[PDB]
Nucleic acid binder design. Structure first.
Ligand code: SF4
Ligand code: NA
Length: 214
DNA sequence: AAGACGTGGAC
DNA sequence: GTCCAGTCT
């Protein structure tokens, strides 16, 4: 695995490559963000944004989601995929906000995780983007980039990846580094077509050198 | 704990 | 016709 100094070097470069990295999910408030991120699991941002475009016009509060039959909401988000479980989780999540959190999105990460459909990744995105709380959400891109570069071991859990980054990066930079890593993986270190040949980190990447040799 | 969930887009 | 875009039971 890379040394701390090297990992910081990698992150510094990603910042130069994607200085404008940000959350690409369209939302106007914390509630819309929460729904959007829940829908985002195993789905592309493009499709989530196309769907919420109309979804957020039809539904604006947790009462709107629980007022329609489950079958109706399922159709409204059908294009997202995993729509049966997500629609059910959303209705249960909205009922919980009303019953347990005074009808508002809680600002605590562990409290958010009590909502159905919300795991650690979802909760971290919400507290970070909506409430400015430092956190590192580890998704497919962050995990892949971390393992290819050697930030951690290939067998590490996503929690392990998260803890490794939290110890190497100043809390004040957690949120932006997370976004920079996501952009790096989404647009450069892609799952199917990584841009190794022109990568500024090729000189220290175990995965890159392994691919170039082939 | 492995396995189900799932449509849409990129090759 | 594969492969890629987290959470729950
Ligand atoms: S060398 Fe390739 S595998 Fe390594 S980080 Fe750059 S694009 Fe990703
Ligand atoms: Na949860």
């Amino acid at each position: 695995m890379l040394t701390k100094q090297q990992i910081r070097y990698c992150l510094d470069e990603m910042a130069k490559m994607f200085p404008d990295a940000h959350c690409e999910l369209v939302h106007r408030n914390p509630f819309e963000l929460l729904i959007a991120v829940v829908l985002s699991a195993q789905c592309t941002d493009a499709l989530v944004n196309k769907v919420t475009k109309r979804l957020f016009e039809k539904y604006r509060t947790p009462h709107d989601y629980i007022a329609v039959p489950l079958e109706e909401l399922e159709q409204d988000i059908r294009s997202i995929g995993l729509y049966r479980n997500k629609a059910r989780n959303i209705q249960k999540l909205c009922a919980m906000l009303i019953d347990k959190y005074n009808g508002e999105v809680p600002r605590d990460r562990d409290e958010l995780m009590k909502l159905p459909g919300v795991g650690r990744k979802t909760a971290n995105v919400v507290v970070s983007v909506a409430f400015g709380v430092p956190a590192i959400a580890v998704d497919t891109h962050v995990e892949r980039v971390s393992k290819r570069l050697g930030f951690c071991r290939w067998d590490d859990s996503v929690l392990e990846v998260e803890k490794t980054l939290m110890k190497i990066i100043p809390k004040e930079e957690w949120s932006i580094t997370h976004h920079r890593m996501i952009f790096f993986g989404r647009y450069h270190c892609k799952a199917q077509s990584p841009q190794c040949p022109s990568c500024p980190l090729l000189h220290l990447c175990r995965e890159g050198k392994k691919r170039m040799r082939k």
